[PDB]
Each structure stands twice: as C-alpha cells, then as structure tokens.
Amino acid sequence: VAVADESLTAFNDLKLGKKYKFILFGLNDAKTEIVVKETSTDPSYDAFLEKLPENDCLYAIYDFEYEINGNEGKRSKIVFFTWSPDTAPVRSKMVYASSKDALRRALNGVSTDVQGTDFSEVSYDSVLERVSR
Template sequence: MCPGQKSWRADHHSSVQSSLRSLYNRTMASGITVHESVEKLVQQMKVHRHGGTEDRLKLLMLRVSDDLQNVIVDEDLTLYVKDVADEENVFKKVMSMFPKTECRFGLYDCSYRTNETMKEDLIFFYWAPDEAKTKSKMVYTSTSQGLKTKIMGGVKYKVEAQDLVDLEVSEIAELLGKGSVLQLEGIPIAGQAKK
C-alpha cells in the first residue's frame, strides 16, 4: 500500500462508525429511534427556501410507530402550506390536527405579527391529552426529551400540552411575544391594540 493511501478496511470501518454515530444520535433514552425521513423534513422546515411556498410544510406531525421502534411522520395529520391556503383560520386548522385521544409530536411553522414586524418561528409541540392511554403517555414522555434535544435543537419555542386550553391562540401568542403579538396567522389577538 502506498503512503497516505487508506485501505478498504479503514474506509469501511470509518463508514460503519459514521453510520453507528448517526443511529446513536437519533436514538432516544426510550430506545426509540427517529426515522431519518423525520430528520430531513425537520431540517427542511428549519431552512426556509425562497419561492415554492406551496410545498413547504406548515405542520409536521410525528408519532411513535406501532412497533414502538421509530418516531415517524404521521402523513394523515401533516399539513403543507397549500393545504391551508383557503382556510379562514389557519391556526385553528393546525391545532385541530392534534388527535383528542392520542399522543403526538408536532412541529408548526407559525406566522405572526408583533409590534415591530411579521415573523415566522417554529414551535415544537409535545401533545399528551388527558384522554390518551397511560402507556402511550409514558412512551411519548420518555421520547420527548431526546427528540427536543437531538432533533429539535435550534427550535426556540416548545409547548407541552395536555388539553385544548393549552392549544388556544392566547396561550401560543403569549409564548411567542409576552403581550407583543398582534396577529397569529392573520387573525387579530383579542385585547391587543395595534401600537
């Protein structure tokens, strides 16, 4: 072998280490792994693309797979910008996607106006409704912390919600602006006069 040349074995070992490191970084304390498609979609939401807003995600809904092995995309409850284009109240539509009796994780691309400007921020939701089964709550709770730190790093706002009151517009507006949010998804916030 020539000096500076790596052997096949060294390249293979490095590749295996990289794959294992990636898998380790996606595995939660619960032993549940985040599916790589989830990571890709979260990264897409973190990095806004210019143009083509119709195919941009508005709400990425995640669930634990039935075999309790992976955090996966819940296709039925995920919304794209085009899905809410004709909605009169986008916020209400997004919040209605959280199931009343099942736990979920959600990443919501929220548009709002403050005293100064229009803003868009991502909000991570850990939804564990009172009506959900105890075992499900335990699985989601043990998975949520790792998901927040390993995948949702850089997401400024995080909400742990147990009932519909936690998903009300006033609660989310307070989280985003401590009294400075005038509109959420184009809907005026009650009690907030334009300053």
C-alpha cells in the same frame, strides 16, 4: 428509541424551505422510532388543532407566524408541541413522555416548546403569548 432519518429531513424542509406549515410525528407501530405521522401546508391555525388526536398523543412542530410592530413585518417561530390529553391511554402517554427528548434534542432551531395536556393550553393566544414575552 430513535428518530426516523426522514423525520428530521421534514424539519429541515419546513425550516429552511418553509415546505410544510407544520409536522405531526409519533412513535411507529413498533414503538422504536419517530416517523412523521403527518404534514400540512395549511396556514390557518384552526386547522391544526383539528388534526389533534383527542384520545391519543403525538409530537408536532409548527412554524408559528405572527405580526410585530417594533420592526414592521411578520415574524416566525418554530414551536414544539407535545400532545398528551387526559383521554390518551396511560400506557401510550408514558412512551410519548420519555421518548420526547429524543426528538427535541435531534431538532436544532426550535424556539419554544409547548406541552399539550388540554386543548386550551395549546390555543393561539396561549402559544402566541409564550412566543413573545
């Protein structure tokens, strides 16, 4: 496997440039590379779980943005989601499981990781709670 030279370029953009609000990667039609399947600059979070393939897997790097009180202001944390519902093809889940670290390691700056195996274990309060404590 491998990662599209354009895949990380999109990450380096959303990070230092805050270009996109998040990215949706995934194995190419040939299953040998990780190309950015989708990107968006939409703030709302209830729009992210709306682009999640209910019956499919994929990698996503969100730029979580929440509020704090200790240092009055907003804080951001890059999250690494890992979609893999109970509906996704078993043959398409084992390929997204192994070639997972392929992306993970390639990206430096990722704060938290979240495995997606249920729409409830990827919700706001779920990702936010694990983004602080």
